[PDB]
Amino acid sequence: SEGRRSDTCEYCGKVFKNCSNLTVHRRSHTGERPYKCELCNYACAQSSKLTRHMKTHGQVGKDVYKCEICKMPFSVYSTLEKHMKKWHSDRVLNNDIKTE
Ligand SMILES: [Zn+2]
Ligand SMILES: [Zn+2]
Ligand SMILES: [Zn+2]
Secondary structure, X not given: OOOOOOOEOOOOOOEOOOHHHHHHHXXXXXXXXXXXXXXXXXXXXXXXXXXXXXXXXXXOOOOOOEOOOOOOEOOOHHHHHHHHHHHEOOEXXXXXXXXX
């Protein structure tokens, strides 16, 4: 039992406690949306994690994302580019990311 009609993020859709704390958090994330997927029940702070997982969401059959060359499950396509570019260059090593 409660009501909220103002003091909420235009991008989270989540109610808050003060319009300035609303403003500063809406800048310190940006991200996209409440990070929440509507097809998975998943969320994580980055921007491009969601826009990539969104455009890679097409009829995966399992309501969870996976590397279509492995069949191996992984949260988002940005972590897969970092898996694929090194977890497939030496044999299935300690997942140490695409970097220089
Ligand atoms: Zn927000
Ligand atoms: Zn999803
Ligand atoms: Zn893979």
